CSV table of C-alpha atoms and ligand atoms in Angstrom, one decimal:
chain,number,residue,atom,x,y,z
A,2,UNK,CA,49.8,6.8,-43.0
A,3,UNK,CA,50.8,8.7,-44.9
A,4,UNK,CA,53.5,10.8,-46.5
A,5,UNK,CA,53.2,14.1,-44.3
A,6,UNK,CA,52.7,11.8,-41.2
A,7,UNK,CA,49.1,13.4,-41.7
A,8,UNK,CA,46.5,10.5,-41.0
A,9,UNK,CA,43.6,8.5,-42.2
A,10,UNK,CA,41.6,5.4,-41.5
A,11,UNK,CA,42.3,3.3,-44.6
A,12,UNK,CA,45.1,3.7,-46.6
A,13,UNK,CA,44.1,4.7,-50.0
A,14,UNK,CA,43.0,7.9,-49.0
A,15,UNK,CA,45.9,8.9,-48.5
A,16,UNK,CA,46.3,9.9,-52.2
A,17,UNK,CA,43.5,12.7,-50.9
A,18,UNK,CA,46.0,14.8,-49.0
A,19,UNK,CA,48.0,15.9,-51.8
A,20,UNK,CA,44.4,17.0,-53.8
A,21,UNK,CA,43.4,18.4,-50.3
A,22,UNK,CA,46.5,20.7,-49.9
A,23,UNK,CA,46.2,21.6,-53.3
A,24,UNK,CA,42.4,22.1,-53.9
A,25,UNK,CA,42.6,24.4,-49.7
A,26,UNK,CA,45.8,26.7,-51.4
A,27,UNK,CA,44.9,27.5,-55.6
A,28,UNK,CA,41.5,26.3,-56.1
A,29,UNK,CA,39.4,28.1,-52.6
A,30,UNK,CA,41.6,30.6,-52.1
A,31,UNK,CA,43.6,29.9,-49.2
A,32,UNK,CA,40.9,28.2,-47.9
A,33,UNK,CA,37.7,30.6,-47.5
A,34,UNK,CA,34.0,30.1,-47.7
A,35,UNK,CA,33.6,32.4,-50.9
A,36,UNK,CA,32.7,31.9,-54.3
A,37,UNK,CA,34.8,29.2,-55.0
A,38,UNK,CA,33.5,27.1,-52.4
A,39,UNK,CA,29.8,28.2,-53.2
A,40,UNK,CA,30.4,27.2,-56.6
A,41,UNK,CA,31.6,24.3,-55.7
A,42,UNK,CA,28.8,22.8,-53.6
A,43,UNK,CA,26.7,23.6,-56.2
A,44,UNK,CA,28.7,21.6,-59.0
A,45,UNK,CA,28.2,18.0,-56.3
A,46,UNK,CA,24.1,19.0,-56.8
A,47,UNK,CA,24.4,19.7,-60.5
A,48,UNK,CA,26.4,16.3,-61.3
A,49,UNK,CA,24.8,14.1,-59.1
A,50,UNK,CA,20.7,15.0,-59.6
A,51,UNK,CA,21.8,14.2,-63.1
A,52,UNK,CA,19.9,10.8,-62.4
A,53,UNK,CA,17.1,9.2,-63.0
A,54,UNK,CA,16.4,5.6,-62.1
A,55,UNK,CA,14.2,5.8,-65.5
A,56,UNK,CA,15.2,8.5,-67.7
A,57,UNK,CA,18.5,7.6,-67.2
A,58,UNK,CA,21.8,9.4,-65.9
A,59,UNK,CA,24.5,8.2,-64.2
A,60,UNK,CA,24.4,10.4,-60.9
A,61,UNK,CA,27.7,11.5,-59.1
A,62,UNK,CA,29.9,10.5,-62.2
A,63,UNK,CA,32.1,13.2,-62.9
A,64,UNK,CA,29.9,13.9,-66.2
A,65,UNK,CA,29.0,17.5,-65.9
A,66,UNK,CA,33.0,17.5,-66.3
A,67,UNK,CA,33.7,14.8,-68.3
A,68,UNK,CA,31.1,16.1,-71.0
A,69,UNK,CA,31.0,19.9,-70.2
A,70,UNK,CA,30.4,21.3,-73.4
A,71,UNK,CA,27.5,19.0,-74.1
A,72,UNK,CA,25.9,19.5,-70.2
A,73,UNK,CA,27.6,23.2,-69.7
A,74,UNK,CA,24.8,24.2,-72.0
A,75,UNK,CA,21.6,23.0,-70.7
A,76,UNK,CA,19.7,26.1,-69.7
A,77,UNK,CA,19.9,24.6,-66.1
A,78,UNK,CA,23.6,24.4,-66.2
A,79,UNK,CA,24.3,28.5,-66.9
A,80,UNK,CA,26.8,29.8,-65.1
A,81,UNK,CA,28.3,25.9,-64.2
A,82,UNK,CA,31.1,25.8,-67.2
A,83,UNK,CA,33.2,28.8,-64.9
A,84,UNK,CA,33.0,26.3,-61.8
A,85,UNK,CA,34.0,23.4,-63.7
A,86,UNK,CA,36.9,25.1,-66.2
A,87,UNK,CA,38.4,26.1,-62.6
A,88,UNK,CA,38.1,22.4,-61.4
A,89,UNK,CA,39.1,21.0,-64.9
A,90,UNK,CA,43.2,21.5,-64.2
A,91,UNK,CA,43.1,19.8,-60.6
A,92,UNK,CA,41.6,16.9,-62.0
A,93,UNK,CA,43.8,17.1,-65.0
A,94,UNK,CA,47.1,17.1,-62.3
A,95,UNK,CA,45.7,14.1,-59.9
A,96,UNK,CA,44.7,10.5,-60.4
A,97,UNK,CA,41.2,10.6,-58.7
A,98,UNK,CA,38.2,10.4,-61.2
A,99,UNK,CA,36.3,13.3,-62.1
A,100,UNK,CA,33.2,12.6,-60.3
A,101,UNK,CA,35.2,11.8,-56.5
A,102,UNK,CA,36.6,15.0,-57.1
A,103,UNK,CA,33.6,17.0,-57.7
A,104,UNK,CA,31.9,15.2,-54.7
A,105,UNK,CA,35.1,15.6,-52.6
A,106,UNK,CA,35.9,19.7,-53.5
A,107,UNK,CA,32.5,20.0,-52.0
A,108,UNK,CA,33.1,18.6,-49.0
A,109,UNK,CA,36.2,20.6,-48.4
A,110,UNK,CA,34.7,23.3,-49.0
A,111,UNK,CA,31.9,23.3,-47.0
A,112,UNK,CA,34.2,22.2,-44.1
A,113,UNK,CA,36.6,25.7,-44.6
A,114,UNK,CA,32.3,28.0,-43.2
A,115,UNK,CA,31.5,29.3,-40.0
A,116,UNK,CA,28.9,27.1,-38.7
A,117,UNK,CA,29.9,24.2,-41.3
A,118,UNK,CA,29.7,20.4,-40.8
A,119,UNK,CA,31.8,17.5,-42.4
A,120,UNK,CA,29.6,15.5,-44.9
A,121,UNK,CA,31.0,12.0,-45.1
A,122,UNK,CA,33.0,11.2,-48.3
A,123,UNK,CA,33.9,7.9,-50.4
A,124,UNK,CA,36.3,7.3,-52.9
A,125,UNK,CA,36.4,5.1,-56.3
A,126,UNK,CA,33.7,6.5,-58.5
A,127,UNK,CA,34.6,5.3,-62.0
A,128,UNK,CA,34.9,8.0,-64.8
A,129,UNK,CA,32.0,9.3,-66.5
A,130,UNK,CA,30.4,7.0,-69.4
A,131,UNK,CA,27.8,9.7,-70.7
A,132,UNK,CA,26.5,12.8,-70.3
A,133,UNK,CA,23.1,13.3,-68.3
A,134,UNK,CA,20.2,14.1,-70.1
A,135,UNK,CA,18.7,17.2,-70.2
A,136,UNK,CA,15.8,18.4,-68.0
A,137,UNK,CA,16.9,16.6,-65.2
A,138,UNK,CA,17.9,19.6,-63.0
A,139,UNK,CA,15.4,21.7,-61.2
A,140,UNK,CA,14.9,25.2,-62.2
A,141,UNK,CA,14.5,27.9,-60.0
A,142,UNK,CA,10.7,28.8,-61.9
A,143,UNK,CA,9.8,25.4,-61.6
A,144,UNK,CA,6.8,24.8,-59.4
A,145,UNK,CA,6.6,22.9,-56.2
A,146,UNK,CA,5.0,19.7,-57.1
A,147,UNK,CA,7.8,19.7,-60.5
A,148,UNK,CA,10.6,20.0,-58.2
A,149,UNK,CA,9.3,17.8,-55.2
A,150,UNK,CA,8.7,15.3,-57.9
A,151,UNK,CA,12.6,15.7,-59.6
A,152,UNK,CA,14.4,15.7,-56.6
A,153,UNK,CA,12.1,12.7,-55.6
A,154,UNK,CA,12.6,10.7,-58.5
A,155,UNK,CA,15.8,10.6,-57.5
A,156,UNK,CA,15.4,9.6,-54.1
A,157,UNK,CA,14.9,12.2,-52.0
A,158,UNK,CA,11.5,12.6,-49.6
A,159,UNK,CA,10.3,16.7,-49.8
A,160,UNK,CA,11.7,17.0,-46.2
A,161,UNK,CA,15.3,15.6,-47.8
A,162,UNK,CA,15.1,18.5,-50.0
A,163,UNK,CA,14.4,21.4,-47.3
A,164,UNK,CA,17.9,19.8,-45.3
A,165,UNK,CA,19.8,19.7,-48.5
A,166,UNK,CA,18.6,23.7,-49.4
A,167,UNK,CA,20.5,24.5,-46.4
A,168,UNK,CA,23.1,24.7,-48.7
A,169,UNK,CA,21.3,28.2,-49.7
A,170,UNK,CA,22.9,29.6,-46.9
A,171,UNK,CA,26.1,29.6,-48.1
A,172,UNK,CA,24.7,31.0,-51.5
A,173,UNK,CA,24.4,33.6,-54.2
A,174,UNK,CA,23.5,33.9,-57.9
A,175,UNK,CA,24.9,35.3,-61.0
A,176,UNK,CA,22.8,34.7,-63.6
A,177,UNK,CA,19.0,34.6,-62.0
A,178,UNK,CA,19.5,38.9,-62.1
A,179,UNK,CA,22.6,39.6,-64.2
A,180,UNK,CA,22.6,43.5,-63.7
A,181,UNK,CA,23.9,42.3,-59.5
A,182,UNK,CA,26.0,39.4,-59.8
A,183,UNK,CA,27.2,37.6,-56.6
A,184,UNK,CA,23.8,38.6,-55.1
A,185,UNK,CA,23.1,36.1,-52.0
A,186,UNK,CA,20.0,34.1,-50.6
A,187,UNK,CA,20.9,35.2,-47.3
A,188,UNK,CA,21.9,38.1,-45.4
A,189,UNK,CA,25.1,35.7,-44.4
A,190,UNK,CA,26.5,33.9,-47.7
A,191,UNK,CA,29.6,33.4,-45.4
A,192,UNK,CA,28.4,31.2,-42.6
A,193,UNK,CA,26.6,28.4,-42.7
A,194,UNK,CA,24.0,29.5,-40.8
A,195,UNK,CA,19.6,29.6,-40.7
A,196,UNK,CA,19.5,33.0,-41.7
A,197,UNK,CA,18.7,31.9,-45.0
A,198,UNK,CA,15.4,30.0,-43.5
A,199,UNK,CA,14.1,33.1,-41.7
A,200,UNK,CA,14.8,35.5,-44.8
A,201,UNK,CA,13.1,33.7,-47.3
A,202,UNK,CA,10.0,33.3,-44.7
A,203,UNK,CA,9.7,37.0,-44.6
A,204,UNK,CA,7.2,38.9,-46.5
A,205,UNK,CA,8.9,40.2,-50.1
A,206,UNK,CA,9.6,44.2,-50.4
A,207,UNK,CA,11.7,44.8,-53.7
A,208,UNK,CA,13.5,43.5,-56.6
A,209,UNK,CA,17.2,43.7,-55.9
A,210,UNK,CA,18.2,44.9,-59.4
A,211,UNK,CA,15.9,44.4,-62.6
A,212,UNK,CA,12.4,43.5,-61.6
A,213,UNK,CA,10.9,40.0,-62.2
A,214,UNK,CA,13.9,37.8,-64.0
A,215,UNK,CA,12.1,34.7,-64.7
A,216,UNK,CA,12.9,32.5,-61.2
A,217,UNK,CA,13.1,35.2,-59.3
A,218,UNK,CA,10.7,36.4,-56.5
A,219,UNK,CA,10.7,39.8,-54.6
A,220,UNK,CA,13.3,40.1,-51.7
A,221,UNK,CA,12.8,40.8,-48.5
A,222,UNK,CA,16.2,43.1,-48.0
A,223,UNK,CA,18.3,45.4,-50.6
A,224,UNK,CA,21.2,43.2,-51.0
A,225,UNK,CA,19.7,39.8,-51.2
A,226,UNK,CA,17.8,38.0,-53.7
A,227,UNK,CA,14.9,35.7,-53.4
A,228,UNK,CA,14.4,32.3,-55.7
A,229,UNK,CA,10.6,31.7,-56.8
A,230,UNK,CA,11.2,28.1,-55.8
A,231,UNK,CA,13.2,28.5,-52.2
A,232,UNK,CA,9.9,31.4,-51.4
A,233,UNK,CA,7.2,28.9,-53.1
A,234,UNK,CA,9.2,25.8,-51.0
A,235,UNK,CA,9.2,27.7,-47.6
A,236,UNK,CA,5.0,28.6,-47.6
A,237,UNK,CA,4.1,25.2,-48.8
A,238,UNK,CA,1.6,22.8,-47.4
A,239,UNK,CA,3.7,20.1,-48.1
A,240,UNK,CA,7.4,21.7,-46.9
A,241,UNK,CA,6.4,25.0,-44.6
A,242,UNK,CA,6.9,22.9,-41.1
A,243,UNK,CA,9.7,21.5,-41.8
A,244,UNK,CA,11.2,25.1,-43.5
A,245,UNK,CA,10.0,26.7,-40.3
A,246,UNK,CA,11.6,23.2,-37.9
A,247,UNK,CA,14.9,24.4,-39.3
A,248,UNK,CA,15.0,27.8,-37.7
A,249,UNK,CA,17.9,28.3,-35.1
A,250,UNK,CA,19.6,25.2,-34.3
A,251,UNK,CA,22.6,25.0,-36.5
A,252,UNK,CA,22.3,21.2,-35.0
A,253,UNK,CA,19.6,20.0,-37.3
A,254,UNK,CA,20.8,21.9,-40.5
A,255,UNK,CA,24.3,20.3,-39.8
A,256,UNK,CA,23.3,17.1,-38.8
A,257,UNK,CA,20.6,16.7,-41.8
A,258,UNK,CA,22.6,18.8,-44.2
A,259,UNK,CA,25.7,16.2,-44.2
A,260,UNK,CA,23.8,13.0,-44.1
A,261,UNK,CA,21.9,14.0,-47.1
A,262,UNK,CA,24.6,15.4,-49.2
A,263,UNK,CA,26.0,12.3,-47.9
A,264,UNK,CA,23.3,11.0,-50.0
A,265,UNK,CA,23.1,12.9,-52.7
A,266,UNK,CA,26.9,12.2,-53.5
A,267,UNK,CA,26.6,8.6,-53.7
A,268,UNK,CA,23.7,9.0,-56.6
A,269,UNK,CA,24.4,6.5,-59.8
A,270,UNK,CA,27.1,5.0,-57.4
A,271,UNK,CA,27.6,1.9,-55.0
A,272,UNK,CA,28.7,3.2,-51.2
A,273,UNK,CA,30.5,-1.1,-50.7
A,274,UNK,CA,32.9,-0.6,-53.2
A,275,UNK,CA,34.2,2.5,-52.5
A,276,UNK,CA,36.6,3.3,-49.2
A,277,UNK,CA,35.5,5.9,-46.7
A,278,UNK,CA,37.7,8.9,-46.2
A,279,UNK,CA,35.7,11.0,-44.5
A,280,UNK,CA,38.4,11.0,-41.9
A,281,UNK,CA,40.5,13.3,-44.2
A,282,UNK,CA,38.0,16.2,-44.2
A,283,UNK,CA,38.9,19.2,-42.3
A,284,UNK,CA,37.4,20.8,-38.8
A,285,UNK,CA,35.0,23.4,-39.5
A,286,UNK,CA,35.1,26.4,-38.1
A,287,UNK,CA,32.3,27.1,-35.2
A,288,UNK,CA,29.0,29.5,-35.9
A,289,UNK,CA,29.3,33.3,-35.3
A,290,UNK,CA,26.8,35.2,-35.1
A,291,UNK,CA,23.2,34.3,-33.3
A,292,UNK,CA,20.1,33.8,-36.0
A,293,UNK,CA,18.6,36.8,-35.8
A,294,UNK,CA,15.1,38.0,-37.6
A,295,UNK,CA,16.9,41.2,-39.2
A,296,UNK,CA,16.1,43.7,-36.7
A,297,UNK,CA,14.2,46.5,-37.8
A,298,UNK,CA,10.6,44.7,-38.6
A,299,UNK,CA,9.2,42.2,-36.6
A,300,UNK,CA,7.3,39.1,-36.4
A,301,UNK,CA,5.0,41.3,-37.8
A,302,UNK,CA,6.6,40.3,-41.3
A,303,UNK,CA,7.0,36.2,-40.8
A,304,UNK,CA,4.9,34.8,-42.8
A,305,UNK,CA,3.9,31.4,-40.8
A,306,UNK,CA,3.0,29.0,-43.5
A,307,UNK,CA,2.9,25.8,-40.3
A,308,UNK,CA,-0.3,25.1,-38.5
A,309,UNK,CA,0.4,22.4,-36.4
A,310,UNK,CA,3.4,24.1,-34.9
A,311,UNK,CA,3.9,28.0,-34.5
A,312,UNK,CA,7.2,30.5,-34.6
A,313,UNK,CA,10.9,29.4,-33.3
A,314,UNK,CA,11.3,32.7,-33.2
A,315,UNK,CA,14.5,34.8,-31.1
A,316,UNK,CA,13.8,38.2,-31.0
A,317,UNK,CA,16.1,40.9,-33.1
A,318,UNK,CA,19.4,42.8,-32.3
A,319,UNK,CA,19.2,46.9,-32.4
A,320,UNK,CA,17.4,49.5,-34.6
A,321,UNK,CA,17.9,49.8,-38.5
A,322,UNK,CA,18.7,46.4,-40.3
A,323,UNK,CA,21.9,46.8,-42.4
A,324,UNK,CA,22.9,46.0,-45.2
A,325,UNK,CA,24.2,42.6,-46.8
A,326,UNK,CA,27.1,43.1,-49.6
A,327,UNK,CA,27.1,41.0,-52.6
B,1,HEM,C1,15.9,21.8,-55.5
B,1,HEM,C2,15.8,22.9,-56.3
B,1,HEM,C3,17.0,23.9,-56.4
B,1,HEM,C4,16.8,25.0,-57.2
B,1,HEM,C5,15.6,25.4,-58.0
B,1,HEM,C6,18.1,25.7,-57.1
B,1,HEM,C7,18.4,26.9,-57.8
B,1,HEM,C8,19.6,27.6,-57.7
B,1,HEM,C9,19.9,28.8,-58.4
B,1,HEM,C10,18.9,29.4,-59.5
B,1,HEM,C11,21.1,29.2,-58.0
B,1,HEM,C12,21.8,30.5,-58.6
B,1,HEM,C13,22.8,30.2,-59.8
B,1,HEM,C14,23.2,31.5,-60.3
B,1,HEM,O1,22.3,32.2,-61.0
B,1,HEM,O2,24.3,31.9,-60.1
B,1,HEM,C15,21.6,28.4,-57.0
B,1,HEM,C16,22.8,28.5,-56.3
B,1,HEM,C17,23.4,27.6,-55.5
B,1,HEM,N1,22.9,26.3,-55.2
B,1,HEM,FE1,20.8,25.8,-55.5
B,1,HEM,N2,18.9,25.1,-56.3
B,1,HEM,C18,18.3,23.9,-55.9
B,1,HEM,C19,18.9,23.0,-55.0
B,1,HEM,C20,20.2,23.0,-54.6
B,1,HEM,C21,20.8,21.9,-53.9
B,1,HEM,C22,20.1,20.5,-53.6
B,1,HEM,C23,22.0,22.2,-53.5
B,1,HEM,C24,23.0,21.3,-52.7
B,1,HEM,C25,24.3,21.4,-52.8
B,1,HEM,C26,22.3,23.6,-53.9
B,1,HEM,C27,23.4,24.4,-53.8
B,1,HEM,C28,23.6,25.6,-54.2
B,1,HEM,C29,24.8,26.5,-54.0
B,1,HEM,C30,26.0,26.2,-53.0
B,1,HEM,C31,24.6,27.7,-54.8
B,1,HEM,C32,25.6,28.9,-54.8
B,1,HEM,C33,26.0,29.4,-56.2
B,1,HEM,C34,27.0,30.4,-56.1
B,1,HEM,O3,27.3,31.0,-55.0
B,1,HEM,O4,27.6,30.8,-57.2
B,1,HEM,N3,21.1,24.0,-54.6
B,1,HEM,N4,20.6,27.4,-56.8
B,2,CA,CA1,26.4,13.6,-63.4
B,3,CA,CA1,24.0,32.2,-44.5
B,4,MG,MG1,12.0,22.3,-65.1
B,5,MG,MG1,28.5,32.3,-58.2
């Protein structure tokens, strides 16, 4: 404990603070909640849902890595191989395996938004054996009951996978609409914020660029884009409380959104023989910014899809709502 006199709980994790230096300087960008981060957090989901007690898959293994070219092309997987070419040399340089790196960068990165939390991390995931199968992703025109049933096959109860779509609000997409790459889901795709929960409960206006890309559902707001499955997800019998439950308080999306990922990283893998270093993830910086509806229209536009309980709703900040760059 440890080299730096930096400091962990158990010893072996200090080999993480040379890959955490490293990964915080060339890979994020100095450390930012951008693109490279984004990307990141979605690489952890893409690896590990790669499982299927079943069908088969071996989880959080480093494969989407480990056999890129054959996994890089699943229709699911486009826009991944960028993301995991970028990630490719860092693993090359240290001597943790593919998949505790994968699982690790997105903790990091997650860590480095406004409004973040620290999702626990383990290390001694052994290196890939096989690539997933196909279909074992979720698709962003896939309906409810297909997707509740993926996600669920893997282990995670329909309220599991509202909490870990959280992740959304650090989010954007570059190949759902081509024509406006780096689109968000939220008016916020820098802080880790509900925004993202509000948005996609309001009614939908527009098509951001070219109208109806397969997965795509109309937008709220110029500047944002809308997923089929996150709109379908948020108005649905079986998820719409919930959805609505995680309107302002960053607690619950924090709390719920690390102890699933928590979750979600340990897929295909045994928690009691690998070592906890959560300890060596970095303080995230606190929320800015109140959730807001986006001023302009009012509740007039929420779409309450909940009986049982109505509106968490703040009211909205002045006038005109602005835009959100891609
Ligand atoms: C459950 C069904 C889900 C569907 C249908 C879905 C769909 C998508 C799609 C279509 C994109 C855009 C990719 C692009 O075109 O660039 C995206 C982005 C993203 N996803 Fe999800 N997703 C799901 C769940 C998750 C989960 C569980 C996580 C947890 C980590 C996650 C994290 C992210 C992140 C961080 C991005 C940002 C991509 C970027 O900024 O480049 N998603 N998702
Ligand atoms: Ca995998
Ligand atoms: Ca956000
Ligand atoms: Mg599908
Ligand atoms: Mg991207």
């Amino acid at each position: 404990t440890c080299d730096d006199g930096r400091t962990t709980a158990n010893a072996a994790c200090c080999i993480l603070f040379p890959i955490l230096d490293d990964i915080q300087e060339n890979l994020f960008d100095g450390a930012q909640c951008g693109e490279e981060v984004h990307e990141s957090l979605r690489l952890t989901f893409h690896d590990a849902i790669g499982f299927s007690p079943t069908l088969g898959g071996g989880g959080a293994d480093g494969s989407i890595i480990a056999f890129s070219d054959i996994e890089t092309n699943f229709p699911a997987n486009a826009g991944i191989d960028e993301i995991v070419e970028a990630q490719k040399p860092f693993v090359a340089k240290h001597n943790i395996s593919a998949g505790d790196f994968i699982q690790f960068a997105g903790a990091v990165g997650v860590s480095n938004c406004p409004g973040g939390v620290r999702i626990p991390f383990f290390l001694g995931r052994p290196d890939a054996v096989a690539a997933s199968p196909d279909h074992l992703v979720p698709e962003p025109f896939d309906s409810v009951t297909s997707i509740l049933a993926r996600m669920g096959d893997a282990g995670f109860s329909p309220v599991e996978v509202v909490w870990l779509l959280a992740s959304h609000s650090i989010a954007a997409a570059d190949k759902v609409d081509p024509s406006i790459p780096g689109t968000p889901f939220d008016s916020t795709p820098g802080v880790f914020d509900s925004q993202f929960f509000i948005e996609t409960l309001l009614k939908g206006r527009l098509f951001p660029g070219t109208a109806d890309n397969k997965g795509e559902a109309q937008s709220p707001l110029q500047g944002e884009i809308r997923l089929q499955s996150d709109e379908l997800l948020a108005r649905d019998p079986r998820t719409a409380c919930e959805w609505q439950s995680m309107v302002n308080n960053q607690p619950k999306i924090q709390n719920r959104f690390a102890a699933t990922m928590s979750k979600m990283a340990l897929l295909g893998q045994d928690k009691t023989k690998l070592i906890d270093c959560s300890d060596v993830i970095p303080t995230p910086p606190a929320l800015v910014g109140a959730a807001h509806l986006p001023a302009g229209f009012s509740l007039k536009d929420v779409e309450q899809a909940c009986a049982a309980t109505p509106f968490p709703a703040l009211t909205a900040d002045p006038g005109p709502v602005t835009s959100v760059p891609p």
